[PDB]
Amino acid sequence: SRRYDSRTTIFSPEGRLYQVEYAMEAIGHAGTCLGILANDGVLLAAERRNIHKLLDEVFFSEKIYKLNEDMACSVAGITSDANVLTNELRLIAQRYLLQYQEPIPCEQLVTALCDIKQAYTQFGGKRPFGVSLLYIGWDKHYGFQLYQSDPSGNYGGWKATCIGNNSAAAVSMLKQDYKEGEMTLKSALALAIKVLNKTMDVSKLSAEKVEIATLTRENGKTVIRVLKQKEVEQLIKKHEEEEAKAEREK
Amino acid sequence: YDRGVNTFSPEGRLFQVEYAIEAIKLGSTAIGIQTSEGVCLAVEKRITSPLMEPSSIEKIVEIDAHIGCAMSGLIADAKTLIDKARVETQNHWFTYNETMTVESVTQAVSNLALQFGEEDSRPFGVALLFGGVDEKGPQLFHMDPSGTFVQCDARAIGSASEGAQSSLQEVYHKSMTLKEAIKSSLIILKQVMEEKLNATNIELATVQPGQNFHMFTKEELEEVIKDI
Amino acid sequence: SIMSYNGGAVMAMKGKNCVAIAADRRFGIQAQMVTTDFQKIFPMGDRLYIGLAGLATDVQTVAQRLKFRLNLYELKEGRQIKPYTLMSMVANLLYEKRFGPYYTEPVIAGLDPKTFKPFICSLDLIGCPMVTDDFVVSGTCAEQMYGMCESLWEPNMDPDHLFETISQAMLNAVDRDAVSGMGVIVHIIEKDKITTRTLKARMD
Amino acid sequence: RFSPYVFNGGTILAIAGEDFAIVASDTRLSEGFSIHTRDSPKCYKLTDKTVIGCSGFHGDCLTLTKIIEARLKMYKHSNNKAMTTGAIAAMLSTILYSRRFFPYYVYNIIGGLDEEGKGAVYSFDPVGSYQRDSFKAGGSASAMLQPLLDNQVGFKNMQNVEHVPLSLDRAMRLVKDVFISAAERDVYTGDALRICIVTKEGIREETVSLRKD
Amino acid sequence: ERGYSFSLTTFSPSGKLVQIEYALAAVAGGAPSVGIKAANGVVLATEKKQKSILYDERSVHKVEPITKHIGLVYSGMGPDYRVLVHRARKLAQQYYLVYQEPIPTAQLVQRVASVMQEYTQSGGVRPFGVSLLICGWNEGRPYLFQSDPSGAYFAWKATAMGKNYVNGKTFLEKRYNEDLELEDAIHTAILTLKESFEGQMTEDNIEVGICNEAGFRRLTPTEVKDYLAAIA
Amino acid sequence: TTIAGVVYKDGIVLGADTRATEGMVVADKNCSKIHFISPNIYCCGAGTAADTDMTTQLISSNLELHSLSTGRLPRVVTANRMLKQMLFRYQGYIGAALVLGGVDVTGPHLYSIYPHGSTDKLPYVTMGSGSLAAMAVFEDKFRPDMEEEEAKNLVSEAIAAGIFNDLGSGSNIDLCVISKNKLDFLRPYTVPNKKGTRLGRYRCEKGTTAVLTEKITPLE
Amino acid sequence: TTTLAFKFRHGVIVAADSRATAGAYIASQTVKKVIEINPYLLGTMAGGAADCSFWERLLARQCRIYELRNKERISVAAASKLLANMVYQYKGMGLSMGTMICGWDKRGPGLYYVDSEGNRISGATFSVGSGSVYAYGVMDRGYSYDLEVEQAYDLARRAIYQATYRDAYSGGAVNLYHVREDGWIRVSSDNVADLHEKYSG
Amino acid sequence: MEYLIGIQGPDYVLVASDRVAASNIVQMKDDHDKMFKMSEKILLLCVGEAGDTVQFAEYIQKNVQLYKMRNGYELSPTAAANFTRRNLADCLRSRTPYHVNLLLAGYDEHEGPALYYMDYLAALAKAPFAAHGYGAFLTLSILDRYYTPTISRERAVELLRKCLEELQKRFILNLPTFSVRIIDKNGIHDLDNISFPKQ
Amino acid sequence: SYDRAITVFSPDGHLFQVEYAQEAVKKGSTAVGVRGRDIVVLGVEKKSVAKLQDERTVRKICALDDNVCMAFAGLTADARIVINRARVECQSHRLTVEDPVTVEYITRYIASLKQRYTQSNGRRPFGISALIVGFDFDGTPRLYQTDPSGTYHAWKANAIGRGAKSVREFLEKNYTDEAIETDDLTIKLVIKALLEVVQSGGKNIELAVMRRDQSLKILNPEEIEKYVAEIEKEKEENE
């Protein structure tokens, strides 16, 4: 009765957990996300999976979910398998509010989820989490905090992050346009727009096929802002229009 | 053909346990000797690098007051058995008010030796050398990983085990004294040690009714080294 | 009784299109003065408050536990909670322990998330629901609280006479019993905007 | 309601000699105004070298005596030897502390041959405390027994008191004399007296009877 | 019992779940099913046809509403359909105890897909081949939802399920435009029922439920012959 | 707090008041003790309001899932067995006084609910502290197989009689009528007890109230 | 039924009386409150006698086991620390332990006083018993930290004798032991009546 | 049973503690420290049932030290006072309850001075002064009628003298030793041990 | 729960997926350390940072106490569990026996816990190892090691990770008893070690030092260029 399980937990002849590779392929398939530098604000961008125009889309944000009032997270992976972690981490951040009656610094919260993400790995031959998600928000100490989750258990957090094989071409663009403050939220809007223009193969970079979200720090609001499609339309149109002015070097 | 890990052998016996019995052969070499004056013992620390600190590696431990023990092969699992059996020696002093007898260490360890099972977890590859002196005088005891206990006047474990006992069968006799047991054993020890003899290569473990504990002390072993 | 230790009276007086709530500023032990700073009314959600009168542990327990459930409710779906579901949520937690019940007198004064309709309810420690459009009060003095509402309060009242009536209400009533005093904090909310006023009592 | 603590009677007397030990207990089982059985010895031999006394509730003493002897075979099949007297006293103290929440009401005295053959007398209490004493007298007749034992055996309350060890039969006839005067009041002490003589070779038992009227 | 509960369904070299791919294959080989969210309410049609004349529609139903205001349809096997329906009825009380109010449409999809996605990572079997279509009316605007074995759910006005779900949907894309009414939704429901017909236009070969803002209404085949006899 | 009713020929008529208070102090004149069960069954609460409401929500819970799964009108004894089983497990820890009645296809059914769970079938039952005068008016004036209109007059006069007698009975009158083809919950009915107009005008005016801090919090 | 413990220029003093009975009835004059735990340590007895004995067996258990862990004698502070909490977990069940922990610490002289109520304090002087009013009172009038070893025996024997004079709960023999750096030194066991001929004449 | 001063300065935080552990009327141990130092920005004060006191010292200190080195920074006095309310909630309803008196004190890098109020009933309070002891009825005149919230520590020590004078009037107890810790923007500092002669 | 055999005993003398999981430590980044009577030091390389973002949170050395420094190799997840587990141990040894944690007590916990973590079924061994660097109480130094089987051993100097035999062969200059007579010589010893170990350099080098009771300090990328300046200039001074 020992031959039925595939030994996903047990180590492999390659010297490492073998299922983690296929886990990184699960998030590394169809998942498209990124991050933008944080100077007095931050924004988020993703790809809308729905190609059907008959859909209602009455749920507001599609791939981005709000864990806390002042802090949310981007997610990439299987929908419901991620939705389990949305309400789970939401309850972990809620039981922290149930403790101190005060928001949660992302540091110990991400490491807590990493200790939860290793549960399926370290016992029972369970299937590891096929979802790797980002982190955004603000704290009293470090200000805007942008982190990253890894299937191996590490928090790979950077102020500029990459998710997906198609977004791996943006890392060269991230360091080519790289600056620090310097960068305005508007500059990061055109930065991430040119990221999708280089990576996403959609002709003309259709605005309704990709998800965009922002965040601001206000006293004491600190609103996580879901944006209408009107400003994104004119944003990408004004972006490729600025690119039409960037081809004048010839 | 891996079946249940608990499966017997057609010869036969437990598969996984017998495989660990062969795993004892790569351990350190240790030789105890039973003598009316006291039970001595020694081991080779097997220096893996000149950076090694001498007091950090010890293959002999002290269970009860007059009861010692040794380790073989894998360490940490045996080190857990050491202090866990010490709890049973203190519980022995609870009701009985006196020191646990050296023969009862068999019932305190070898009974719980392998409890492993899939439900309610894996065997051990370490054989223990039980030294001590009970009310009947000096006693040298040895147990295997499977729990089988046997009383031996001299027992060797690890690499030199078969070779040391085969050579020591001639030099041992009922009239062997303490000092003679120490200096006649290090002749085998200097034969079974690869590195040149020094204070950091080997350590001595002794138990006597009138001199203790002791165990043994350093810088005296060097006085025995010049007596080689 | 334990209700005679901390005491306190939460007076929620609904107006015409708006709902108001008031409580005493003093937080102390019996007649020995401690401090007036602790407010027995806590904001919960958007455009909704709750009054609490009883053991300060259970008062803050409802404050933290309602914040627990309400945050889970608002973070799941962004819809604002309706006051009827809120009352059933309060009566649920108070009924969770039948033989272990805490000591509290929850008074919820809130608005309608969809419209301008106000809301008032006052429940016991076992969560006995009462839904009316008139007023809800929970406190020590039985004759004084409801007596001032019978002698003054009317169904249709403007915020001007609403605060003046509840003023003399918290004066000719709360000042009768010494367990509550040392100032009164008033919270009046409406769809238009939120207003907060305070009062003063003797400092002896 | 039902009271689990009730006194069924019994008395313990144990005198530790030089190379011997003298243990005595009354065979009268008396609860209230009724005499149940006229022979009920409270002194049983755990081993051949040890005899323990019993007092207080009846079934608790029989249960405790059987539990102690039940652990003797465990130690016998373990170390291939019986338990020492001091080990039985300490193990009994640990058994009495395991019940410290709701313990028995019992008083025992352990006696017999020790390592050197001397007699043993231990003062026991339901909470499991004890020490080594020369002489102890249990039961409700201990009122005038202890002062007289402090006189002859304890060598106190005497003017210019010389100290000499006591012989075997002297303490015997002393036990026979003291229980006649000790039965003038206490109703639990009387009828037949179970005597236990502990010697280096073995342990002997005898009986002395009193009027049943 | 054993109680292994291990996760044995694992990631493919491409990253997907081959077992869930077999699950969507059971849905793709499922019975034709369709529903339409338009204006006031939602209409459910699908198809039920017995293996012979020995069976009737008057007793066993393929469409059992979850609540009085909430109906449900699906594709795949019935035994596992009534299993998740049984859990849906039980879970409806876990909601109603705290709220003491009826339940929103998506509120079922959140907890049902969570238990369904939990049943993936959980041992034993998986969501199998039952893809449920949840509909209802709340807050003045009704809803039509459908999830998959993996738990991914989407919202739309109308869709086709089971066999020929791509062909019937491409026909509904041109027919459905702007908004439609309940009568028009039933009319094009006859059109998508005539796609795989078989048993369209006949009252005993189909069952028609309808959601409305006044609450879900389940009509007997008698009303199915009323509107469509005379079909279109 | 008084609940009573009588089963007439073709159906069941029940009644309750709205008065729930403590002592002689007037607190809450308006309270609904008639709670929903199902189309064929209603329930009348008494004793502890919150505990009996959570009990009737669990009974309405069991009858909601079972009737929806069966698709048929359940019998009153189905909920009565779980009612008498749950309250019997506590042996009267939670005080429960209820009126369990309804008209099914099998006809009308009535069962008296006690904290121990003992249930007996009668044409009429009276629960609460006002059950003395109500039972007296019933037992004296009741005749079997009355019509619906005469039952309404009997329930109206019986509940209005227990108002003055009982200390905690009064304020509004509630009517509960259960039948096979009709379900009537009529609230309110008649308010015999009232409180007169104020003796004088204490109405407050500005200038006599000192305000320390007035905070303004604009919304939207 | 009264003891005293105090530390001075050299080591700590452990004193006790041998008379402990139930009521005014004379029963056992051999009662020994001072109990040996380790050769370098000494215990006391207060409240329940068996509780003091058993919890000292557990105290010696954890000390010896730890002595076999790191091969080092644990500090007396960290020794009875957990002992205070482990006995405190039974509070309300009838267990009362007022014992004092005596011995030597590697940092210097020390004395520890543990209560079942949860009081654990390290200080110079501590005494438990019925004659504590005479023990504390007549000693503290003449007490000094600069006293010698022989003077410590004289003041301890005097304070114990004053506790055995008027107070009827004290008597029998005087148990007086001394603690030193290398280890506690057993001093003497003397009868109260014999020491009465000393002080009085 | 005994009162500890609650003086709250704008820059500083000042308290006092009586060091007498003696029982009944006898004079035994006067040096027992009633002040528990936790971190640089947070102090601890616990008095009550014996075993309950030291246990709250072990649990709260090591949990604050846990959060200290986990996140690298120190908790604020607000999060520390509300964290102890959870332990006071477990204190209230438990199979083995606890009994305490004193409160928490500390400094914050933003809110500055913070002095809370704790009780075995878990009720939270934040006040410029505290209430304890049997001599509080003369503090409604000396302490309460005359107090300056903006005064420095110099007049605060003199106000502590005026309290210590009338603290012993009809009381036959001793209480000779009073220990004082002072908190400033730089953390906890120590002040001299107060000792009053007899006559 | 979950019943299955982690690894079974093979006649070759060791288990399979445990002793072969030592390759997970062998494939990790290079990590070393040096104890000293004055200041204790360590080092790590192969940070693989993007250099455009904040890498401060990926730091490979944490502290249970100011006197205790944790140096590990291998994957991060099992390292973080070793962190939090040792935090429960150092805090439990903070509550009980108030004085700080001795190295033998924390090494016994970390090693034997991992051993009993390899014992019970349904528990996969950590794919990581670690070595302790710090100062024992009363001024004594400390260094030890950890094994996937949970065996701890104290060396004179710490060389592990990728190229353990390469750096240990480079320790031929470290065998000198004069090292280190001063803290500047200790950092110069780590400078020569970090320059040799392994791929380096100028960016991915990450280390820190602690001297006696003074808490550990992480120098900015300024003095690191100064130690790299005099170390690179020492080759010109040796001509």
UniProtKB/Swiss-Prot annotation, chain A:
Subunit and interaction comment: The 26S proteasome consists of a 20S proteasome core and two 19S regulatory subunits. The 20S proteasome core is a barrel-shaped complex made of 28 subunits that are arranged in four stacked rings. The two outer rings are each formed by seven alpha subunits, and the two inner rings are formed by seven beta subunits. The proteolytic activity is exerted by three beta-subunits PSMB5, PSMB6 and PSMB7.
Compartments, as annotated in UniProt: Cytoplasm; Nucleus
Keyword Ubl conjugation found: no
InterPro entries on file: Ntn_hydrolases_N, Proteasome_alpha, Proteasome_alpha-type, Proteasome_asu_N, Proteasome_bsu_CS, Proteasome_sua/b
PANTHER family recorded: PROTEASOME SUBUNIT ALPHA/BETA
Name assigned to this protein: Proteasome subunit alpha type-4
Listed NCBIfam families: PRK03996.1
A GO CC annotation given for this chain: P-body
Expression induction: Down-regulated by antioxidants BO-653 and probucol.
PROSITE patterns (UniProt xref): PROTEASOME_ALPHA_1 (PS00388), PROTEASOME_ALPHA_2 (PS51475)
BP GO terms, sorted: proteasome-mediated ubiquitin-dependent protein catabolic process
Entry superkingdom: Eukaryota
Protein's job: Component of the 20S core proteasome complex involved in the proteolytic degradation of most intracellular proteins. This complex plays numerous essential roles within the cell by associating with different regulatory particles. Associated with two 19S regulatory particles, forms the 26S proteasome and thus participates in the ATP-dependent degradation of ubiquitinated proteins.
Sequence similarity: Belongs to the peptidase T1A family.
Modified residues (Phosphoserine): 12, 74, 172
Organism of this sequence: Homo sapiens (Human)
N6-acetyllysine carried by residues: 126, 175
From Swiss-Prot, chain D:
Glycosylation sites: 30, 181
A Gene Ontology cellular-component term: cytoplasm
One Pfam short name: Proteasome
PROSITE patterns: PROTEASOME_BETA_1 (PS00854), PROTEASOME_BETA_2 (PS51476)
Modification sites for Phosphoserine: 34, 40, 134
Alphabetical keyword list: Acetylation, Cytoplasm, Deafness, Glycoprotein, Host-virus interaction, Intellectual disability, Nucleus, Phosphoprotein, Proteasome
UniProt family annotation: Belongs to the peptidase T1B family.
Role played: Non-catalytic component of the 20S core proteasome complex involved in the proteolytic degradation of most intracellular proteins. This complex plays numerous essential roles within the cell by associating with different regulatory particles. Associated with two 19S regulatory particles, forms the 26S proteasome and thus participates in the ATP-dependent degradation of ubiquitinated proteins.
Stated name of the protein: Proteasome subunit beta type-1
From Swiss-Prot, chain F:
Active site residues according to the UniProt entry: 1
BP GO annotations: proteasome-mediated ubiquitin-dependent protein catabolic process
Tissue expression: Expressed at a low level in colonic mucosa. Up-regulated in colorectal cancer tissues.
Top-rank taxon: Eukaryota
Keyword Hydrolase appears in the UniProt entry: yes
Class in the EC hierarchy, top level: hydrolase
Reactions listed under catalytic activity: Cleavage of peptide bonds with very broad specificity
E.C. number(s) listed in UniProt: 3.4.25.1
Protein name: Proteasome subunit beta type-7
Naturally occurring in which organism (per UniProt): Homo sapiens (Human)
From Swiss-Prot, chain G:
A GO cellular component annotation in the UniProt record: proteasome core complex, beta-subunit complex
Alphabetical UniProt keywords: Cytoplasm, Host-virus interaction, Hydrolase, Nucleus, Protease, Proteasome, Threonine protease, Zymogen
Complete-protein stretch covered: 60 to 260 of 263
Organism: Homo sapiens
EC number(s) reported in the record: 3.4.25.1
Record's subunit section: The 26S proteasome consists of a 20S proteasome core and two 19S regulatory subunits. The 20S proteasome core is a barrel-shaped complex made of 28 subunits that are arranged in four stacked rings. The two outer rings are each formed by seven alpha subunits, and the two inner rings are formed by seven beta subunits. The proteolytic activity is exerted by three beta-subunits PSMB5, PSMB6 and PSMB7. Directly interacts with POMP. Interacts with ABCB1 and TAP1. (Microbial infection) Interacts with HIV-1 TAT protein.
EC class name: hydrolase
Name used for this protein in its record: Proteasome subunit beta type-5
Reactions performed catalytically: Cleavage of peptide bonds with very broad specificity
Induction: Down-regulated by IFNG/IFN-gamma (at protein level). Induced in breast cancer tissue. Up-regulated by sulforaphane in breast cancer cells.
Molecular functions per Gene Ontology: endopeptidase activity; peptidase activity; threonine-type endopeptidase activity
Result when mutating residue 50 to V: Displays high resistance to the bortezomib, a proteasome inhibitor of the chymotrypsin-like activity
Residues annotated as the enzyme's active site: 1 (nucleophile)
Family from the record: Belongs to the peptidase T1B family.
Subcellular location per the Swiss-Prot or TrEMBL entry: Cytoplasm; Nucleus
Main localisation: cytoplasm
Chain sites annotated for binding bortezomib: 49
